[PDB]
Amino acid sequence: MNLTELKNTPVSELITLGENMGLENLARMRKQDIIFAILKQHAKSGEDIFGDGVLEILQDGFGFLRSADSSYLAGPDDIYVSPSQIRRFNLRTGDTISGKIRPPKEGERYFALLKVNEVNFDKPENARNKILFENLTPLHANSRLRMERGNGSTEDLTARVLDLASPIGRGQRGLIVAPPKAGKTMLLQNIAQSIAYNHPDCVLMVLLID
Amino acid sequence: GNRRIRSVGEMAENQFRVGLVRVERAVKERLSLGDLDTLMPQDMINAKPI
Ligand SMILES: Nc1ncnc2c1ncn2[C@@H]1O[C@H](COP(=O)(O)OP(=O)(O)O)[C@@H](O)[C@H]1O
Ligand code: BEF
Ligand SMILES: [Mg+2]
C-alpha cells in the first residue's frame, strides 16, 4: 500500500476507511496518527507497504523519511531508516527516497524501511556515480525561462512585464524588493502558474515562512 | 590419577563459552527475522553480555 495515496486523501475519507475497518474511533485524533493507525491495521492484514518522502539525517546516525504534505514534520508518519542504509547506499540529507516499509515490531513506533525502490527518482546504482554540489562548476544563466503564455488574460500581462523588465533563466538569483501591501503574493502565484505551464519538466517548489 | 586440576585457562575458557552461547542464542533469535544485505556482523552481537 502506498503512503502518498492515503496522503492525498482528505480527512473524511480516512475517517470512512477507518470506520469501514471497524476499529476504535479514529476521527478523534490527528491526521498524522490517523494515517499511522489505519496503516498499522491495513499492514497487520495487507501486502508489503510502500512509502515515499525526503530523508533527514539525525545526529544518532539514523534517518527520518518525512512527507512534504506535513511540511517535513516529526510525527508517527515518519519512516525510520538505519545507518546501515547510509553506509550501503550512503544516504544523504535531502534525498527523495521511495521504497517498501513494514509495521514496527514490539516496542517500536516508527515504520521501518525494507528496500529502496527509487532514490531521487533514479537508480541506487546510479545514486553512487553522482557529482557533489559545491564541487560543481557554476556558470551564468544560459537558458532563458519563457514566462509569456501568449493568451493575454487579465493577469498574464503581469508576467509579460517581467519578460521585458528582468529576464530570468535557469541558474539566476532573483530578489524581490517590495514594501508590504504591494501585490507580491499573486505576483509569485502568476509566475509559478506560468513557469509550471510553460515548463512541466523542471520540478518547481515554493517556500512560505511565517 | 582420578582428580584433575584446573587453572585460570580452562576456567576462563568455560566462562567465555557460557557468555558465547548466551550471545549466540541472542543473535540467533535476532537473525531469525533478519534479511539479506541489511546488516553487518557488528551490531548483531552485543558486547555487554560478554
Ligand atoms: N494582476 C492583478 N490584476 C488585478 N488586480 C490585482 C493584480 N495584482 C494585485 N491586484 C490587486 O491587489 C490586491 C492584492 O492584495 P494582496 O494579495 O493582499 O497584496 P499583498 O499580498 O501585497 O498584501 C487585490 O485587491 C487586487 O485587486
Ligand atoms: F502584507 Be502584504 F502581503 F504585502
Ligand atoms: Mg502578500
Curated annotation (Swiss-Prot), chain A:
Residues 61-66, 78-80, 108-110 are annotated as: RNA-binding 1. GO terms for molecular function: ATP binding; ATP hydrolysis activity; ATP-dependent activity, acting on RNA; helicase activity; identical protein binding; RNA binding. ATP binds at G169, R170, G171, Q172, R173, G174, K181, A182, G183, K184, T185, M186. GO terms for cellular component: cytosol; membrane. One of its GO terms (biological process) is DNA-templated transcription termination. Residues 48-123 form the Rho RNA-BD domain. It comes from the Bacteria. Changing F64 to L/A: Defective for RNA-binding. Its EC number is 3.6.4.-. Keywords: ATP-binding, Helicase, Hydrolase, Nucleotide-binding, RNA-binding, Transcription, Transcription regulation, Transcription termination. ATPase activity is inhibited by bicyclomycin and dihydrobicyclomycin. It is an enzyme of class 3 (hydrolase). Belongs to the Rho family. Facilitates transcription termination by a mechanism that involves Rho binding to the nascent RNA, activation of Rho's RNA-dependent ATPase activity, and release of the mRNA from the DNA template. RNA-dependent NTPase which utilizes all four ribonucleoside triphosphates as substrates. Each subunit has two RNA-binding sites, one at the surface of the hexameric ring, and one at the center of the open ring structure, where RNA helicase activity is thought to take place. Homohexamer. The homohexamer assembles into an open ring structure. This is Transcription termination factor Rho.
UniProtKB/Swiss-Prot annotation, chain B:
DNA-dependent RNA polymerase catalyzes the transcription of DNA into RNA using the four ribonucleoside triphosphates as substrates. Transmembrane segments: none annotated. It comes from the Bacteria. This is DNA-directed RNA polymerase subunit beta. Belongs to the RNA polymerase beta chain family. The RNAP catalytic core consists of 2 alpha, 1 beta, 1 beta' and 1 omega subunit. When a sigma factor is associated with the core the holoenzyme is formed, which can initiate transcription. Signal peptide: none annotated. The chain holds residues 449 to 498 of 1342 of the full protein.
